[PDB]
């Protein structure tokens, strides 16, 4: 090797990296091999305490659940006055709003129409829309995004929309824009480790504008609801919230305000749309990649549900294989590898450490969902991670895709309904045909700053 002469070396070419959440999570696991299950990362003078492995996560989020139930401060969210909902609130405000929302989402105050009724209706509309693709190759991203968005619409203001309604398209457009901004990959430039969009000029303003747009649209619905508010006839989240505001009068200052109603409603759209959509889209990809799994799901659907009626949640206890498949989708894909960041609510002694009030806590959900003792070969998609040796469904304490403790996803039950009812309804009515031969079908996730996101794929929905 004797290359021609030339100038003194220039900067490095083609080695600037877009860091996704799955790469962050891999580094966290690597660091746990050096420092153990509880360690601190410093970003300048800001410490972040990482919890890695089931025993650390359980001891903190569950055994000390109150102390680890804080959210912390996010500056851009504070500019949008977002701390007045569920996701970003803390202390007394969070406790009452999350409790109120939980019970509303378990059919208290929501009228006769159950949450399951609303999901079932959306499931039938979802199947109709898949029919309209006429078995031609289809990128399912849009249709699978509409259905969970429509479920939240029906819960919050008792309205679902045709997938071509402009009002509905406008709302999803802003939600998709915000999700794209907020979940962009990371990058290190000089002594800075930052989201990429922090460099992109219009991003922070577009996020604030879209959030203002969404709150303003919800406010328009709230005013309509105020015209007929009826303590004896609430029928959606807005009605329930307004009834609570009525009962909390004279007890000022209430946590329940129009400002709190708008941020809670925005929270539910942002937390409940793209998580479910992305899990569904990933589910269909895994079902294309694993045709023998799909055949057994469809066999189980035929013998428990048949083809004459819609799936319902009572069917799931009789469909252990399908239940294992849905669980395994969520465990395998590891949708939110580091959940959402917590903070401790007070000074707390934790093992040999003293964690001051307000310290950021980062939870490795990957380290639990992919525990190689609880789930041997955890890198592999295998419904038998949730079946015992007799083929019965096997619940795991390591099933934490909604996190754990006091901040566990408030939509856990609703998301489980949407996953089970939508996937069984699709597979009750359609065979899935991949253009690619399954053996050559790529399932490697794409880089994303917050979530595990599946690659692009198309498929045919072939009616039965
Ligand atoms: C496959 C679907 C879903 C997954 C995997 C999921 C997962 C999660 C996770 C990991 C968190 C963070 C928990 C923590 O901070 O430790 C969370 C929070 C949250 N989720 Fe979900 N979620 C899903 C769907 C939904 C749906 C349908 C709703 C509708 C209500 C929802 C509402 C929320 C809310 C409001 C929070 C904030 C809770 C709080 O800060 O107290 N999610 N979710
Ligand atoms: C977690 C980091 O968030 C941030 O750093 N957000 C911001 O900086 C920000 C600024 C304006 S709006 C907004 N975030 C949201 O509205 C979210 N809603 C939900 C609902 N479920 C899950 C996640 C979100 S983030």
Author numbering: 27 to 490
Question: Please, what does the article write about this entry?
Answer:
Mtb Decaprenylphosphoryl‐β‐d‐ribofuranose 2‐oxidase (DprE1) is a flavin adenine dinucleotide (FAD)‐dependent enzyme, which together with decaprenylphosphoryl‐d‐2‐ketoerythropentose reductase (DprE2), converts decaprenylphosphoryl‐beta‐d‐ribose (DPR) to decaprenylphosphoryl‐beta‐d‐arabinofuranose (DPA), an essential cell wall component. Multiple covalent and non‐covalent4 DprE1 inhibitors have been identified and showed in vitro and in vivo activities against Mtb, further validating DprE1 as an attractive anti‐tuberculosis (TB) drug target. When analyzing toxicity profiles, we noticed that many TCA1 analogs show inhibition of CYP2C9, one of six major cytochrome P450 enzymes which determine the clearance of 75 % of marketed drugs. Here we report the X‐ray crystal structures of WT DprE1, a TCA1‐resistant DprE1 mutant, and CYP2C9 in complex with TCA1 analogs.
Similar to the binding of TCA1 to DprE1, the thiophene group of TCA007 binds in a hydrophobic pocket of the 2C9 substrate binding cavity that is far from the iron of the heme cofactor where the reactive oxidant is formed, thus preventing oxygenation of the thiophene moiety. The pocket is formed by the inner surface of helix B′ and adjacent residues and hydrophobic residues on helix F across from B′ and helix G above TCA007. Mimicking the role of DprE1 Lys418, Arg108 donates H‐bonds from Nϵ to the carbonyl oxygen of the thiophene carboxamide (3.0 Å) and from Nη2 to the thiazole nitrogen (3.4 Å). Phe100, Leu102, and Phe114 form a hydrophobic pocket together with Phe476 where the carbamate group of TCA007 is bound. In contrast to DprE1, protein H‐bond donors for the carbamate are not present in this pocket, but the cavity is open to solvent and an ordered water molecule donates an H‐bond to the carbonyl of the acyl group. The pyridyl nitrogen of the pyridothiozole group is oriented toward the heme but is too distant (6.6 Å) for coordination to the heme iron. Consistent with this observation, TCA007 does not significantly alter the visible absorption spectrum of 2C9 in solution. In contrast, miconazole binds to the heme iron of 2C9 and alters the spectrum of the heme co‐factor, and competitive displacement of iron bound miconazole by TCA007 reverts the spectrum of the miconazole complex to that of the apo enzyme. This portion of the active site is also hydrophobic, but a molecule of water is evident 2.88 Å from the pyridyl nitrogen of TCA007. The water molecule is hydrogen bonded to a second water molecule that donates a lone pair of electrons to the heme iron and a H‐bond to the backbone carbonyl of Ala297. In general, the extensive hydrophobic interactions and hydrogen bonding interactions with Arg108 are likely to form the basis for the high affinity, reversible binding of TCA007 to 2C9, but these interactions also sequester TCA007 in position that reduces the likelihood of metabolism, which is consistent with absent or low rates of metabolite formation or time dependent inhibition.
